[PDB]
Amino acid sequence: LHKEPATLIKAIDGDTVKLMYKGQPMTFRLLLVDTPETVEKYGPEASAFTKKMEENAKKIEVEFDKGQRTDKYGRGLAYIYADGKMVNEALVRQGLAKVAYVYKGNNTHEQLLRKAEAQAKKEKLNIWS
């Protein structure tokens, strides 16, 4: 997998963000994460977390996996990086999201995320409170 540059347009919530990708605006859905919807418990926490991480970043990069690249709603399915730090992973590690079921072969980082989740659970962080 290879990372590509992107520019933040607008943070929508915990699991979705609008980015300028290859010259055009596009909505992306973060791969392998399930964040509380915004209003479920920790929903606003997850949203603020993602928003702060994305808006303060110098560089935003998108990384598509090896499976299908867009869901039924036209959203791109990818791992998002803020200054080299994967947002998908940070959310799970901080206990603000759970690892979702693999979707159409997009599982390159499933183990990485599963381990981050086990640690958040052991630390009883937020959702695991």
UniProtKB/Swiss-Prot annotation:
Region: Disordered; residue ranges are 109-129
- Which residues of the sequence carry a binding annotation for Ca(2+)? D15, D34, T35
Active site (catalytic residues): R29, E37, R75
Q: Where is the composition biased (Basic and acidic residues)?
A: 109-125
Chain segments annotated as transmembrane: none
Q: Where is the protein situated, by its record's location annotation?
A: Secreted
Protein name in the entry = Nuclease A
Q: Which organism is it from?
A: Staphylococcus aureus
